[PDB]
Amino acid sequence: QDPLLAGLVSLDLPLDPLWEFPRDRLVLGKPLGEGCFGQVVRAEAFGMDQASTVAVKMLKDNASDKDLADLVSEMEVMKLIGRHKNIINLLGVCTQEGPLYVILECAAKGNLREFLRARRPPGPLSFPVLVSCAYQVARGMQYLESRKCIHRDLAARNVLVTEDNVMKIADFGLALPVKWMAPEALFDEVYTHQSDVWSFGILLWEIFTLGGSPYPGIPVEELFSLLREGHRMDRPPHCPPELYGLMRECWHAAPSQRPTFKQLVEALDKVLLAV
Numbered sequence: 661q662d663p664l665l666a667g668l669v670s671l672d673l674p675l676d677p678l679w680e681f682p683r684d685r686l687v688l689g690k691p692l693g694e695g696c697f698g699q700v701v702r703a704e705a706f707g708m709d710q711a712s713t714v715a716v717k718m719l720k721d722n723a724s725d726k727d728l729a730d731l732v733s734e735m736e737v738m739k740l741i742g743r744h745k746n747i748i749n750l751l752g753v754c755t756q757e758g759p760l761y762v763i764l765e766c767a768a769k770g771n772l773r774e775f776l777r778a779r780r781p782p783g784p785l786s787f788p789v790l791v792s793c794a795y796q797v798a799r800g801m802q803y804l805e806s807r808k809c810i811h812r813d814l815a816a817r818n819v820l821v822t823e824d825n826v827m828k829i830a831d832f833g834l835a836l837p838v839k840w841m842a843p844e845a846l847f848d849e850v851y852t853h854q855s856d857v858w859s860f861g862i863l864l865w866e867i868f869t870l871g872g873s874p875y876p877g878i879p880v881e882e883l884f885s886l887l888r889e890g891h892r893m894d895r896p897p898h899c900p901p902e903l904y905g906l907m908r909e910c911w912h913a914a915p916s917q918r919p920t921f922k923q924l925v926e927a928l929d930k931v932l933l934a935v
């Protein structure tokens with residue numbers, strides 16, 4: 661569906677030597693995630709002669725030309741963003757023989773919401789652990805921001821956790837969200853780094869409720885009035901007033917009066933020090 665994937669015996673994509681990875685240094689494995697976002701499998705990559713575990717995205721066997729365009733586009737965007745510890749990094753691509761493969765870092769523990777929820781108490785998710793989670797995501801957003809990247813969908817479901825409990829921001833939209841959207845984004849479809857800061861506030865609340873759902877009991881069509889009327893979430897039980905103070909600053913109606921990601925990193929770093 662239709663002309664490029666049906667008509668071509670081979671897809672003559674341009675060779676980019678900086679990123680091309682040999683297909684025979686790759687051992688494809690088990691599917692990864694629930695497949696909302698294309699086909700992604702776990703794999704072993706050799707010499708990234710030590711293996712290492714990676715994630716590999718490819719086209720579903722019924723993909724359309726539009727899915728082809730989206731994967732290439734995602735791939736091209738990730739080449740320009742550059743690497744950072746707290747984001748899902750591009751590791752390589754396979755474009756020259758056979759199937760298009762996009763190789764990404766694997767985060768073995770899944771997404772941050774589920775990680776938190778699984779380790780809820782009846783400890784594991786101590787204050788220092790939660791602050792560390794927040795801090796790492798803020799560092800990743802600070803980086804993304806410095807590359808002029810606006811996420812637009814920052815949420816704990818979109819932060820992946822590696823084997824070493826490193827936070828890695830994923831992004832499935834490089835090519836439901838309403839409870840994470842800044843008022844300017846809801847009402848006027850305006851997206852800025854400051855609207856990401858608002859989302860980060862919602863993520864902070866997610867962290868300190870141990871994977872709780874935002875605005876419990878409130879239907880998405882009402883968030884509408886509520887946010888305009890100045891409604892904000894309350895303090896999570898597992899949360900010092902000072903961290904709640906940060907959340908609340910992130911939900912300022914005025915984008916200029918929300919902290920910057922640089923500020924959030926410095927404040928969270930200081931809390932971490934105090935342990």
Ligand SMILES: *CCC(=O)Nc1ccc(CN2C(=O)N(c3cc(OC)cc(OC)c3)Cc3cnc(Nc4ccc(N5CCN(C)CC5)cc4)nc32)cc1
Binds near residue numbers: 692695717764765771
């Ligand atoms: C609808 C819910 C859903 O399916 N979510 C989901 C889909 C796919 C993946 C797999 N990915 C992934 O998409 N990553 C990624 C790809 C990409 O393409 C351009 C860009 C990204 O950011 C810019 C990221 C890469 C990646 C890295 N690590 C993991 N790790 C992971 C481990 C375990 C699990 N689970 C295992 C078992 N169970 C029961 C639940 C979850 C999921 C992911 N995945 C991906 C992830 C989520």
